[PDB]
Structures are given as structure tokens and as C-alpha cells.
Amino acid sequence: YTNINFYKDAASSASNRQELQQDPGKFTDPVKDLMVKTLPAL
Amino acid sequence: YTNINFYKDAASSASNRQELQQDPGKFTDPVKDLMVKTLPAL
Amino acid sequence: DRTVANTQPSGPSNSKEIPALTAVETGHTSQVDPSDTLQTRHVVNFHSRSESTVENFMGRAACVFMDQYKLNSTDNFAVWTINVREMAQLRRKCELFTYMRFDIEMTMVITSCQDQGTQLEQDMPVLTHQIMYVPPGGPIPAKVDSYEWQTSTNPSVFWTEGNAPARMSIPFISVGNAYSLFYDGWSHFTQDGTYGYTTLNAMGKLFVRHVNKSSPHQITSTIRVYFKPKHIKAWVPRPPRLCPYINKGDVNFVVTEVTDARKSITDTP
Amino acid sequence: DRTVANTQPSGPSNSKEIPALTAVETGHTSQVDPSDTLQTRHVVNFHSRSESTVENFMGRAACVFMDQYKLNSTDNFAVWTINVREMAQLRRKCELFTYMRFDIEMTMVITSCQDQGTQLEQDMPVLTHQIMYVPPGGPIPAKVDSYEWQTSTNPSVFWTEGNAPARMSIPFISVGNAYSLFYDGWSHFTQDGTYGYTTLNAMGKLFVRHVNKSSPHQITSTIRVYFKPKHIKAWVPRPPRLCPYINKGDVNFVVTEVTDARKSITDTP
Amino acid sequence: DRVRSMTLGNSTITTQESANVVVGYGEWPSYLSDKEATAEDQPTQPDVATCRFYTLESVQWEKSSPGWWWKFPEALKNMGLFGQNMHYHYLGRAGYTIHVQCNASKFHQGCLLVVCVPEAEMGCADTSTTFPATELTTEEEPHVFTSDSITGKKVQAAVCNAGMGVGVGNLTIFPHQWINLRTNNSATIVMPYINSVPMDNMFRHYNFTLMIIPFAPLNFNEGATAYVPVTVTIAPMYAEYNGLRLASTQ
Amino acid sequence: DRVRSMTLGNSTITTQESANVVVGYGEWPSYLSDKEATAEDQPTQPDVATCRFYTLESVQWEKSSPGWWWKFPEALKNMGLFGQNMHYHYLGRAGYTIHVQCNASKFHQGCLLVVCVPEAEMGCADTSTTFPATELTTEEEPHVFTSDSITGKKVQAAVCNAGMGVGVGNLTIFPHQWINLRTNNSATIVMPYINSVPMDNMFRHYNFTLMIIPFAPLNFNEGATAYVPVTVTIAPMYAEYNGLRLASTQ
Amino acid sequence: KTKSMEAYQIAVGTGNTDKTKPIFSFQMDPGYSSVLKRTLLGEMLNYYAHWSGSVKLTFLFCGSAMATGKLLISYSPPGASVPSSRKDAMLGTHIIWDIGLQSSCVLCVPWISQSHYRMVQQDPYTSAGYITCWYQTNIVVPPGAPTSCDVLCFASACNDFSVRLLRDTPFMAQPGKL
Ligand SMILES: CCCCCCCCCCCCCCCC(=O)O
Ligand SMILES: CCCCCCCCCCCCCCCC(=O)O
């Protein structure tokens, strides 16, 4: 079970509750030039 | 039957009512040194 | 379902490396870890961010509409314009993103109760209800026995009382590529008309009525609708709304306070 | 499912072996078998300790809560703090271990009855009930028509009367690694506050109400909740409680008797 | 097998008549592992300074003595560097070995039960109110049981229920040993760390309680020594501490 | 090369204008070896608790200030767990890193000399008598020099001789650094353990003395800030202790 | 100041008076402490009932380029009273910030807790510590420069932060129909 669809329509399906994907780099690091933590920022 | 799960969650499962494991040595024999029944205790 | 990062052992250090020092004018958030500034041991973390996902966060029913219709003029049926800006509980959650795509799974709860009168002796059979979704531009009924109720093409659901609540699924039915919750524009090209998100909201209406013709004494019913978004995708996170809502149509607000007042700067309760 | 040990044949013996003699000051329980001190035959035992397991022992529903709410101020809804120290039948069974991990399978039974009055003529449709579990720290409703009842995030169950009783499953929701039934400590770090297990119990509240708005005459309902632990693990067995319970909050007791009085030391009934 | 010698730190205990030591539940105390750890810091691990025998005050076993109890680990405060580290540390872990000494001649009779009850909870004499924290722990002298029902804002010290609402004779389920004057004069019990959370504050939590109850009354004839002392010695083992801050005055 | 970052324990020091750190005599501090050891016991070696930066009280550098001196390691007592271990331990070993901070704008001028003198001995103003131990060490405030000859049962605090009977300008032989307001605002000196015996009592022996003497007087015009503070921070390193007994009240 | 821009400004001064008193002090608890309750981290934390991980706080010095000084910021683990002197605050997790070209320093709280998770609501069993700041050295400015400057603080979670239990936020209420 849990992987059998009894309805042809795609909207008639269970929610995707077992997906884990992350990408925090979009907001935390938006700078064009790479910054190294050990090296001075400026 | 009896081994098919229709729900993804693990809590949504039947109770484990066919398990038999015992370990009475924890309480009956807590002594550090081994004691032999035939041999005198002290 | 991966776990969070583990902690790495550290020791005393004296060198020219400066992980702590940084510049906040660049617009970058520092990535310093606790091991970088302190001596830490090695621990294995099995904690998982499994319930912080958008799909799980939005995956729970919430009330969107409530109205009453009676069985004994215009009080025999209810009319609702499908919008998600009528209940504060779900409005605040869905205003954290600018654009969103999702598929709703609507359900309804219908209850009936006899009205208090001088004479209450009556015997009535079971009751039945009909719910009809009129597509945008379709004819709207004006009476309980109007001709629009025969749903040749429009969807309809019939639910006899005493059974399980009805449930239906609706796909992405937006003209654009996503649902625009916030729209900064005017309806007309001359910068006139209605300013707000009402222009882009073109969802149809909903009609509920009693199938039974009449009762010896008045009976009133209440319908509650719940929505659950699934297969959801979100874009452009937004800060949470501080001020309480005033009107459903617009985002007008009153001046509020950022945080609760404290006695002094160095006051620890 | 293995069986118990079989009996081995024995015969007359005269030697220096002393299985019977032992020392009880060591803290060890003697392992003497009946064959060691008597002449026994050979028998095959097929008896199995299959119902003495903790999982089977705890695997049976027990009543945990009972209250009444009415349909016609604060009597229209019931509030319960989720605790397992309110019914003696299940409290005694769960106090034989110090720490335990388990998953409950809650079910509810709801019954309604009309109240005795001078005028009883009424005709009412079926009734519906809602049960809401408020997580710790969540807002608590103060009225039947309060805004907290729309469960945007909190769970809820709707059960129309006449159908099968509702059932739900709840996982391990404790902050620590197990449920501490007995806690020998104080809430505050200055050795003050409340002494007992109440500090560690942080479970949320439960709310039950009537979905129907009103009835011509008063109607009262009663809800009973049953819990069944499954996937259970136990640690640190404890002696059974002798004295009857006095208060749910604490373990206060009165002096009792170990055993029933007999006429004399050599009195056989 | 009667003789045994225990050495820990700079202290040594020697016994000539005793029984085999009892390890609590069959598990020797050890250090916390990385997988089971939850904290994120470098724990301080003193070895010789905070892990050694500490001899508590002694008590006299009279003929009518009902019993005594101690509530560790708070009783071990203000002694050595073990208590000092407790004041400066929010969290800690430790294991203990308990040695109880009581000696008599061959013309004396009596029996003692030494048992460690984990998470023992004491009820008040007045069921409608609570008692101050001084009654449970004093940290200097043992608290005494009683042979009759008592009243007030105090624990029910009746020996029949032992203050826990359970039978006194059923306490043998927990790790225990017996001291019979005819056979032995010393009892030793090794206990591992038992708690729901990996680490907890020592001051506000009482892990275990040591109870000594005389099942057989002490009896002797004229001319024998009437002063029989009972002494308890405990030694912490595998002490670990996480979290450093200012000292707590308590 | 101006920027430098130092991390020890749970404390971190950041500087943006400084010079390369000076290691005392070119040897980094380390632990005692077995061959060079003389004691017979297991040393206690705290790592995070007793090896971290400790910021002392600050002082104001006025135009007429003659200078100040501090006598470690006694000045480091009663601060954290470093002082507490000293009371309970007869012997100890440690190394130190000294960081001195003093900042000013580009319109201020002045120079400071920071030098650590090992085994510095101070003579009395009255050559025929001795001074009490309070004059040498107070453990709370810096002792001040003077620009003229003084009298009494006190040390000769004249800046000309510095209290040691030697020229003030010849102190550069010992490890030292200079703080010039035009160039730098922080000085860092790392010192290893220097003593004739491998270990010695901390209370009764003063290993080294930190002296700050302004060779160039501070000068500024009207409108500039007149309150220039000087702060000293020291962090013990590789602390080791042998010998445990009752605490010493001193 | 809760309805203005001065709530975010931590004033600093150059003087000899009150140099032994704390600059600011507040509770580390993110769930209910008024200082950081309504921040971005707090707002998402109020939709949940359990939390774990580490938090990092950075400070920006908004002053004249000619000004220089040092500051001491410390975190005291729970179990004792709030520190009242710099000698009490130097026995915990502390970092010394030298104001300069970088103009920012980061302080990290290394998740010191007895259990794996804590509770967002205030409960005596699980509580965090206190954050305090002190004067390592006074602030020195040249003549012709502003005497007083300001400091701003930013708070964010680390990479080991997680929340498990799901509840509703307590910051939203609807008295009547909109
Ligand atoms: C009653 C049976 C027919 C019901 C048809 C489905 C109800 C129509 C709702 C469609 C719109 C759903 C999503 C809109 C949300 C939004 O406006 O952002
Ligand atoms: C009514 C639908 C929602 C119901 C949610 C489940 C009920 C919450 C109970 C959770 C705690 C169960 C186990 C606690 C036992 C204990 O406190 O030892």
C-alpha cells in the first residue's frame, strides 16, 4: 500500500509528506563574490 | 494478511503480541562473582 | 529524511584566523558554528527537520466559511464568493509567501437544529442538501426553485444527513502560473478602479440549499467549509503580519507596537 | 514462543554437594530446582509464558476520563488536562515501572439523553460532536462560539451519532527519552515550588463541544475516553501500591495493614 | 572469598568478612558516548579529585531504632571538590559505590536491610498539604523512621509503608543486601546512573535514596557493649560535568 | 597582517591594528614531561574551565601618569575556577598570554612600553627596614609609580630606577612591545613558564611582573576626548596542578 | 519606544560615570522573552511547541570612524542568579569585541541543556540563561567628534536548529466578523 493510486486524476492523490530538500544559500549568501569565514570579509 | 501495513506512519500499526524474550538474570543474579549451586556459597 | 549536521571536536587555538569578525553591510548572514569560537566535543545529531517543510506546515484543515440557511424569501439559500481572506487563522499562514501553487481538498460539515417556538410538535424524515459551484460568468440562481439548480454542466454534491462529511478535490484553476496573494496594481490601465488583490481573484460562487420543499415548523442549518492545501509550492517568503486585520477586501491596518514594553534596558524577569 | 523448561529424572544421592544450602545475605535468589532435592520423573512441559509479557499485559483498553456537557454558560463544553492519574484501575497497573515508552490508541464513546422536564415534546435531527486537542501553549477557547474552534493547525475529529466509535493513534510525544511516572524533585532550582510528578507532565488539554447551535429543550451528553498502550517498553520494576489512593496530584497515603489478621500462628482454615 | 579490597583515588577500604558485591542491574558505570550525548561542549572530567570515598556521619543502632534514610546526591555536597564542582556546574553525571559498616561480637544478634530505591517519592502525613524541603533532606544527619502514625507537615515515616505507600517486605525487588551479625559485618552495593534524561541538575533532583531498616531487633545480655555504631561510606565514580557559570549559593 | 584573532576556551579577542605577537624567548608553553617530573601523583589538568581570558580592571592614562605594575599570578586569584584550584592545590604550573588594549584617534600622541620582568625584586624606600606584603600586591587595583623620591615603609616607585635599582631604558632586554597611538592600539605577549624548580607554590612566589611605563607623554588639544582607558587581559594556558588538601584561606 | 525607531538603538557613551553597570541584559529564552519574541526566529518559533539547536547574535557599531573601544558580551548558563558585576560575567561563555574595520562580532550560544529539546512556553523545568554586556574599556573619541554612538543587534538560528511539535500562534485573534 501507500503507493497505489485508485483514481486516474493526479489531483486525486495523497500529499507528499515525506520529502526533505533544502537550499538556504539563496537567502543567507546572496553575494556575488565568495566570502571565506576564516579570511577577513573586507 | 497480518503483515501488510496500509498506513505510512509507524505508530499506525498493530501491537506486537507474538514476542517472547526473557532475561531473569538481571534481578535474580546481580552478584559480581559467580556462584555455583553445588558448591557452598561462602 | 536526512539529519542535521554533527558537531566536530575543537581545541585551543591562537592564530590569525578570525571567524567571528565579519561585515554585516555586505548583506550576507554569517555561517559561524559553535565549534569555531569554543572548545566542543563530538556529538551525533539525529534530529530531522521533517515537520518544518511547507507541505507539512500547510497540510491541515482550516475553516474558511460559515453561514446559515433556513427551511420553513432569500434566506433559504446561501451565496459565497470563494476567497481565502475571510478567516484570520488561515489568512496569516498564507500571507507569508507572495506566489503559491496548491491543490485544495475541500470538505463540509452540515448541522441542523429546530428553532424555538410556541408549538414544536412535528415529525420529519431525514434531510438532504445540495451544493453547487457556479463557474465564473455562469448564471446565478435567484430562487430556491429556480431553473439554474439542475446542474447540466456545473458540479454538485448531494449529502444526506447522518453519513460521513463530503469531500472533494480541486486542481490548479488559476489563469496565471501561480496564485498572486499580493498585487500592487490597479484594475484599469488609466491607474483607476480598485487597488488590491481583488482584481486578480476571479473565483466563482457557491450555492447551498435544502432539497426538501417544506416543513411544518421552521428549521435552520449551518454549513462549515474546511480547506487543506496539498502538492504545494511557495515563492518569495514575506515577513509575518503584525497588526490585526480590519477588512477582508484590503490590507488596511492601524499603528501597533513592535514588542511588549519592559521596565528598563537591564531588567531581567 | 518457546515453552518452559522440562523436568529431568533424579535418583538417590549421598555426597558433599549441597544445592539446598545457600546464603541470602549476598542478595542472590537461589536457583534450586525440584529435581535437586527430590526424586522426580521425566515430563515434557509445553506451557508458555505468552500472556505474561508487558505488551500483552498492557494491551487492553481502560477508562481515563468522564465528563458531561449540555446543549440548551461554561457548561456547554468540557476541559480535560491529559493525565493518567485519575482512574485507579489503570494508575495501579502503570505504577509498577519507573520509566515507560508507549504509543496510545485513544477511542471515545459518546451518549446523549434528554433531561426530565415538565414539557418534553420535541423533534430533533441527529447530533454531531467535535473534539479538539490543544497543543501545550496554544490558545484555549473561552466560549462555545469562540474563534479557537476553527482548527487551522490543531487536530480535530467530527463524529455523528449512530456510527462506530472514533479511534486515533498518538506517537511518543515526550521531551525526554521516556515517561517518568515518579519524579523525586522540585520544579525550581532553589528547592521550592511543587514536589511530585506534576512538573514533568506537560501534556496539552482537550475540548469537546456540540456542533448544533440550540435545541428546544435541554439535552445532556457524556463522553468516555479509553487508552490502549502499544509498542511498549518498561524499565525499573516497582513494588505494587498497597494503600488506596487519596489525591490525583500527589502520592499521599494513610497507614494500612500488610496482610489480613489470622487467629494464631498455627491456624489453618 | 570473605576478604575483599577496594581502592579508589587515594582511599582504600579493607574488609575481612563480607559477601560478593552486588552490581546494580548487572551494568558497571561508564562514561557517556557521543551517539547518546545531547549537549554541545567539552565536558570536564576530574578523576582523582572528585572520585574517592567520603565517610558520612555515623549513627547508633539502639534496640528500638526504627531505621534511617539518606537522599543522595545532595548529601554529598560541601564535601571535597565533588560539591564544589556541583555549585559551578549546571549539569552532571556520576556513579556511586555504597559501603555500609556495622560490627558486633558473636554474642550479639540482629539483621539489617540495605536497599537503594531509585526515584523514591515520599508522601506527606497531612494528605491535604505539602511539607517543606527541609524534611526530605538535611545533608548533615540521617532522618529517622517511626513505629506509629505521625501527623503534621512531615513525611509519613511509618515503617509499615516506608513512606512510599508500598509494603516494607517487598523492597527486595530493588538491588539490596543483608547484614547479619552472625555472618557478615559489611555490605557493598555498586549502582550505575539511572535517569530518563542523559544529564540532570543535581541540586533539584534526587536520583536515589538509601534506606536501612532493622527487620531483626538488636538483643544482647548484660556485660556486652551497648554502643554499636553504623557508618556509611560512598565514593563517586565516573564524574562528568557540563555547563560552567557562576557558583550557586545553596 | 594588521588583523589577528585569538580564541581560547569560550572567549575570543579580535584586533584590527596590531603587530606580530612576541613569544617569550622563542619557546611556546607546553606540559611537563615524565623525565623532567619530580612529583609522584596524577596531576589534574583542567582545559576549558581554567584556561581562558580574564579581563582585569581598567585604568585611565592621564597626562601626568607615571605608570603602573601588576604582580601575577596572585592577581589572577578569586577569578573563575583558576583561583579556586589554587586554594585547594599546593603546587601548580601555568603559562600566560597578556593582551593590553589602548585606543586613540589620529589627533592624539603618546607611547607606552609593555614589558614582563621575571623574578623582579622591589627594594624599600627606607633601606634599614622592610615593607608589608600589601604594598607589593593588592589583587584589585594597579600600583602606581612616582616621579620623585618617596619615603616610608614602601617600595621606591621612582620611574628613574623602576624600583629594581636598574636603568629604566635598559628594560628592553626582557620580552617587550611598544604601543604607539599613531601605529598600533594593542600589544600581545606570550610567556612560557620560567622557574628554577619544575613546580612552585603560587601564593608565596611571584613569577613575573607586568610594567607599563609611558615614555612619551599623552598630549591633545581642546575638544578631544580626555578619558583614555587602558585595559589588560590575561589568559592562563596549560594549567597543571599537583597536591590536593583542604582549602587555604588567604 | 515600542512605537518608534529608538527600540532598536542600544546607546553607548563616553564617560567616567556608571562604568561598572550593565549596558543591557535580557533572557536567552527565544520563545517568550519580549526582546526577541517578535523577531523572524521568534515568529516561526511560536507556530511550534518544541525547539532545539543553537542561536548566534551579531552586533553592528554605528559610530564615527575615528571612535575606538572594546566590549565584553557574556552568556551565563542557567542555574544561578543574573550576574551583577563583570567578575561574575567573565566566568561564563564570553567574547571580547575590539571595534574596528570589521565593525561586527558574533556570539554563539552552544546549546547547553539537560534534555534534547526545550519548550517554547515558559516552564521552570527547561529554561535558558541570560545575556549581558559590560565595558572592557571606555570609548575614546578625538576632539570634534560625536560623543555618543549606537549599536544594533541581529539574531539568527544555526544549522542545528529544529522544531518538532506543531501548534497555533498566540499572536493572532479575531474578535468578530471581518
Ligand atoms: C461542491 C462541489 C463542487 C465544488 C467545486 C470546488 C470549489 C471551487 C473552489 C476553487 C478554488 C480553490 C482555490 C482558490 C484559493 C484562492 O482563491 O487562492
Ligand atoms: C481528538 C483528536 C486529537 C487527539 C490527539 C491525541 C490526544 C493527546 C494525548 C497525548 C498524550 C498521550 C500519552 C500521555 C500519557 C502520559 O501522560 O503519560
Coordinates of C-alpha atoms and ligand atoms in Angstrom, one line a residue, chain C residues 82-84 102 104 106 108 131-133 155-157 168 170 173 179 201 203 206, ligand 1:
Chain C
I82 CA -14.7 31.8 -2.9
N83 CA -11.9 33.7 -1.1
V84 CA -9.3 32.8 1.5
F102 CA -1.6 24.3 -4.5
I104 CA -7.3 22.1 -2.3
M106 CA -12.5 20.8 0.4
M108 CA -18.1 20.4 4.5
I131 CA -24.1 22.3 -3.0
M132 CA -23.4 23.8 -6.4
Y133 CA -20.3 25.6 -7.7
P155 CA -20.7 20.2 -10.4
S156 CA -22.9 19.3 -7.5
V157 CA -22.9 17.2 -4.3
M168 CA -13.8 16.8 -3.0
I170 CA -10.0 20.7 -6.9
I173 CA -7.6 26.6 -11.7
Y179 CA -1.8 32.4 -7.1
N201 CA -9.4 37.0 -7.7
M203 CA -13.1 32.5 -8.4
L206 CA -21.0 28.6 -4.2
Ligands
LIG1 C1 -19.5 21.5 -4.3 C2 -18.9 20.6 -5.4 C3 -18.2 21.5 -6.3 C4 -17.1 22.2 -5.7 C5 -16.0 22.8 -6.6 C6 -14.8 23.2 -6.0 C7 -14.8 24.5 -5.3 C8 -14.2 25.7 -6.1 C9 -13.0 26.3 -5.4 C10 -12.0 26.5 -6.4 C11 -10.9 27.4 -5.9 C12 -10.0 26.8 -4.9 C13 -8.7 27.5 -4.6 C14 -8.8 29.0 -4.5 C15 -8.0 29.7 -3.5 C16 -7.6 31.1 -3.8 O1 -8.6 31.7 -4.3 O2 -6.5 31.4 -3.6

